[PDB]
A paper describes a structure:
Major facilitator superfamily (MFS) transporter Rv1410 and the periplasmic lipoprotein LprG are involved in transport of triacylglycerides (TAGs) that seal the mycomembrane. Rv1410 (P55) is a major facilitator superfamily (MFS) transporter from Mtb. Being classified to the DHA2 subclass of MFS, Rv1410 is likely a TAG:H+ antiporter.
We finally succeeded to crystallize its close homologue MHAS2168 (sequence identity of 62%) from the thermophilic mycobacterial species M. hassiacum, purified from M. smegmatis, in complex with an alpaca-derived nanobody Nb_H2 using crystallization in lipidic cubic phase (LCP). The asymmetric unit comprises two transporter/nanobody complexes. MHAS2168 adopts a canonical MFS transporter fold, featuring an N- and a C-domain each composed of six transmembrane helices (TMs). A conspicuous element of MHAS2168 is a ~20 Å long extension of TM11 and TM12 into the periplasm where we hypothesized the presence of a functionally important periplasmic loop in our previous work. TM12 extends into the periplasm by 4 α-helical turns and is connected to the 2.5 α-helical turns-extended TM11 via a linker loop. Finally, MHAS2168 features a small periplasmic β-hairpin between TM9 and TM10, which extends along the membrane plane. Curiously, the cavity does not extend as deeply into the transporter as in the case of other MFS lipid or drug transporters due to a constricting salt bridge (comprised of E157 on TM5 and R426 on TM11) and its neighbouring residues in the cavity. The only charged residues within the otherwise hydrophobic cavity of MHAS2168 are E157MH and R426MH, which form a salt bridge and constrict the bottom of the central cavity.
Numbering used by the authors:
A (entry chain A): 16 to 54, 58 to 202, 209 to 233, 237 to 510
B (entry chain B): 1 to 39, 45 to 116
Write the structure that this text describes.
Amino acid sequence: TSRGIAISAGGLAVLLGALDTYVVVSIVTDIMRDVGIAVQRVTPIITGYLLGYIAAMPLLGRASDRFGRKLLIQISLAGFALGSVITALATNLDVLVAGRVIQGAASGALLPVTLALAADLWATHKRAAVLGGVGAAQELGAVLGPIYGIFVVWLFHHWQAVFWVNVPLALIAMVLIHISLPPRQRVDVTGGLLLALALGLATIGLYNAGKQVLPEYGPPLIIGAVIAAVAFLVWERFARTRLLDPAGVRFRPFLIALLVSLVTGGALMVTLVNVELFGQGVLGLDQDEAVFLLARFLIALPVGALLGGWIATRVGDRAVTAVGLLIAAGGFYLIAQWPADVLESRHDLGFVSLPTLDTDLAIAGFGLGLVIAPLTSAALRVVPAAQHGIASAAVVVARMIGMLIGIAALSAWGLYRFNQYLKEQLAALPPAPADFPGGQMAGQMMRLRTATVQAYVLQYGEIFAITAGLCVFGAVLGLFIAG
Amino acid sequence: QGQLVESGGGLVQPGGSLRLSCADAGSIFNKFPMAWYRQRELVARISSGGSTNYADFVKGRFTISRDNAKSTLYLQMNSLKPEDTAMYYCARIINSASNIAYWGQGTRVTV
């Protein structure tokens, strides 16, 4: 039966859209040159994409319950091409952000709609292995994206090439999907747009780029997001159409699956930002080097996603999410023990030894990887067919929102306790060095630098100790997932 | 706390011995590389996990070690020579790649 070929064609679209997510990380500077922006106020090129990616997802997911899954993959691929062209044509930041928004909204649909395609063509008991492949295609593309950006600029010497190359690839993807997928009234537009508005307010309000973690425009957008979320809940009690129709949905396991997904997203983003900051601040790496620290964490995620799906066809979603999150917790407990000379250290197994940095990140990312497929499986288990699209979107939007809530909350606490640690360090370091090169002001500046580094390393520990604890809390919730 | 407080210097007859101590706080005692320096001149270095490293003039005559019960770094110095006369400092190496360090008021050793 052609379902294997169909989900392969969908997975290649998911891969294609995932490259476009973080591709900008390697071409920001080349964009800054051509658009005329000084050494960032460039952030709309990521926050605008993420707005489209998150906010448009539930409604485009729901649209696939009505208009099917082939048509929306085609539409989003055409929109992914269109947005790419708009960005390639940009003399102006205002045109880049518009095109990135369209690319983001387009690319946001591909993963949920394809997860729902897998849910249509497979029964639950073997489905988790297929969700692992689709999820692997997402996590792998997200990680190869920056390299794809480098490579096409090495080919074509202009960053615009990224978004020109998107157009043929999108047309190729539409061709594969046209021949591969099964052939073939309203959705809740008002609720979808209300939810999109709420998600957007939260996404702008939470994202940030030194004694304050939210933008000053953040708090009112966040409080507005709660209000827009209430308005969404209130509307759909009086709506005839509902975005997720509650008939037959078992909400206790469904909502626990969303909350665990939220937790996993926080643990992901917490690691993505703190490890790179630990690279620059404690290890003294270039920004380009510090991002590359994330490699073994980033590579381990798709490996976990693929294998966790296969194991979950056999041992169950509850178990793989629980064990996978305990593997993630173990990884984060190890990362909490990092010293400032971690690159020089190894784990000693007596008769083999392993690099500390690389394997702690591998363990942490593999644990989070194991959880992607069985969480999606267990959310889809407790919803009817023709709610697969909106249900797949909910799991991803929960993960994406959990990323932003995670950094905001843990950075707030980390910053609070950093300052308390800084009080302790300044009180305890030798009040001056004896014969410092450059004189006493250089010794006092170095004392202040020494205090901030020592306090930052103490902050770093608690953050990943809490992140480990929250993974254990998620692992426990994993046992109240569906079965 | 987060200290670096030397003690244990004194007068020594050639061939004699001393144990220098460096009080610290367990919060950070085990999270950075440490070293002892002469007056600057590196004597001994220890990674956060205990990997030792020494200069040429040491000839295996000293040992750098950690005691986690009182969070003290030590130099046991044996068979001391007139050339070892110096101020000794215990230093925390705040960046290991650049070997940027911080240290306190030392302790003087005279042989």
